[PDB]
Design a protein around this ligand. Structure first.
Ligand code: AMP
Ligand code: CMP
Ligand code: MG
Ligand code: MG
Ligand code: ZN
Ligand code: ZN
Lengths: 324, 333
């Protein structure tokens, strides 16, 4: 069993970086992926899970863990610039980080921590590099199949759970039936919370909660839904170099989508037009209307355990306002 | 085009029955299926869409309608005892009856009426004879695909909108874009409201609207809002689906013999897979009569009572027949 779960060409350099970076906000996942040779998701997940004793706690065989994580990782599409396994690993680590706020100390069961971190790692698996709305305007097969509701998010979940079915990949094989049913329902609810069409409702829920303690599932689970959705939308609150990197990729993906939407004669989807999308304006607008309202609330929830996040978010917002 | 959409051996019998029965509570859908050579769904739908002027209003070509309906009808499985095209024709006619209550006069737009009646016709298409819970308990493919959520209801929808693809089957071809898309959303919301795990939630919405009507004082409820209206239609198609126990006893009993056959087949499969046998699915343990009284006390009667309270006094006959049927089964224990 190697130190990082799967063998890499740079075990000592990755170990140094993991020991300094895994509990920090602002991890260079791109470099982890280069040093691990395509294995940021696999190595990040493995070491998060050991650090939180989750393999021991849930009797997960560490070989079975690595084998499953390698399958999921190779199910993300390398040739998709943003929605690949690097994005998954970033989301995973940012979720791991979010959980450590003092204000949330001693609150979540282990099973709930297991759920949210598993969700993060799988939440974009097999993404094809187009949006839900594009699936729906082309009448793509998955859009028809899911009746327009959460088309990708549903697909991500389906793929993740079909992989658990493969010979010697069943990482939850040693939970009881009751813990496996409650785990499955939690994972479903969590990855579904990554669907943008839920953003308004989850955030009204979080605002309501802050405007008041939590030992009802109902509240905890609403906090974990907001949390994974925060991690997913963390990029603009990351150090600027990392924000810009993630952004260049997202836009390259969107623009590529705009070309199939242009080279099939349709109403080019939003921010997807190479010709006349204002990239710096487009980010300022995403912050003001989407990302800032979310992070402000989250940060209000965990007062003051996440002040840095809200500070960098505000700086990158101003930086872009200037470079338009 | 033949008088009833498809040709039948018994046009004049059917004419007579459709002329007298289709605005009544409790229509003998089995006999209409026998008389039309297995086309109850197609002939009932054609005839209701005629009586509502829905072909004319939405510019639906009658040959296109008939073609689409035959395909839907075919895609119900005739070997499933209960969830076949006869169940669909029952649900469709019953939803048609329920829209007539005087307390609903002019509440709904034509496109809403179009939606709920289309929905009813498709709402169980391709049903394989086993529940959601079974597909989830077996991790069947559908259940994995849909993440345990309204599994069949989602598949019924998928199959119905695909058939609309097919060459010369797009009944909604002449609606505008903003219309096909508002229709599509409504139809989805309406077939999803037939998933039983929505029952409690839907019935609480309906309770809210009843209490909201009783306190209004023009005793009329404000329904300018689409989202209130859709709640009512959701409850209504769900009522229609669960209308069997409030149907004339003879009919309720026939529907029920079919439903128990399907249930018992599923518990056989469960047994064979060494799995928990679902409620009402065990031929070795189930007591049919007791189970009906229980389903009526706990699910059916609270739903209908609330529906009847909303449209009071327009659906009195329904609650009465439901209570007499309850009491008949109690005495046969
Ligand atoms: N930097 C950004 N600018 C604009 N939209 C973003 C950005 N980051 C995330 N999003 C949005 O958030 C969604 C997150 O879900 P996913 O793309 O499946 O990871 C995206 O598809 C976009 O709608
Ligand atoms: N007579 C009955 N007894 C028990 N359950 C019923 C009865 N009639 C309808 N149902 C239930 O109501 C459901 C409605 O959904 P279907 O038409 O898909 O399958 C059905 C069963 O849960
Ligand atoms: Mg996603
Ligand atoms: Mg059904
Ligand atoms: Zn994502
Ligand atoms: Zn039904």
């Amino acid at each position: 069993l190697p130190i990082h779960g799967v063998e890499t060409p740079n075990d000592n350099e990755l170990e140094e970086r993991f020991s300094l970076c895994l509990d920090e906000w602002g991890v260079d996942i791109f470099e982890i992926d280069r040093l691990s040779n395509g294995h940021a998701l696999t190595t990040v997940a493995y070491r998060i899970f050991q650090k939180r004793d989750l393999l021991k706690t849930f009797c997960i065989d560490p070989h079975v863990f690595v084998r499953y994580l390698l399958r999921v990782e190779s199910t993300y599409h390398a040739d998709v610039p943003y929605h690949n396994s690097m994005h998954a690993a970033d989301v995973l680590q940012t979720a791991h980080f979010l959980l450590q706020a003092e204000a949330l100390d001693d609150v979540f069961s282990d099973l709930e921590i297991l759920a949210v971190l598993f969700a993060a790692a799988i939440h974009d698996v097999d993404h094809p590099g187009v949006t839900n709305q594009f699936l729906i305007n082309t009448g793509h097969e998955l859009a028809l199949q899911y009746n327009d509701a959460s088309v990708l998010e549903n697909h991500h979940l389906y793929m993740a759970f079909k992989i658990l079915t493969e010979k010697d990949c069943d990482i939850f094989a040693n939970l009881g039936g009751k813990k496996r049913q409650t785990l499955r329902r939690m994972v479903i609810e969590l990855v579904l919370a990554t669907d943008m069409s839920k953003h308004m409702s989850l955030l009204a829920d979080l605002r309501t909660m802050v405007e008041t303690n939590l030992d009802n599932y109902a509240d905890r689970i609403q906090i974990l839904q907001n949390m994974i959705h925060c991690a997913d939308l963390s990029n603009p609150a990351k150090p600027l170099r990392l924000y810009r990197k993630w952004t260049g990729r997202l836009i390259e993906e969107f623009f590529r989508q705009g070309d199939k939407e242009r080279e099939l004669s349709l109403e080019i989807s939003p921010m997807c037009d190479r010709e006349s999308v204002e990239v710096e304006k487009s980010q300022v607008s995403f912050i003001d209307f989407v990302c800032h309202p979310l992070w402000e609330t989250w940060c209000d929830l965990v007062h003051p355990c996440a002040q840095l996040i809200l500070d960098t978010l505000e700086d990158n917002r101003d930086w872009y306002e200037c470079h338009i």
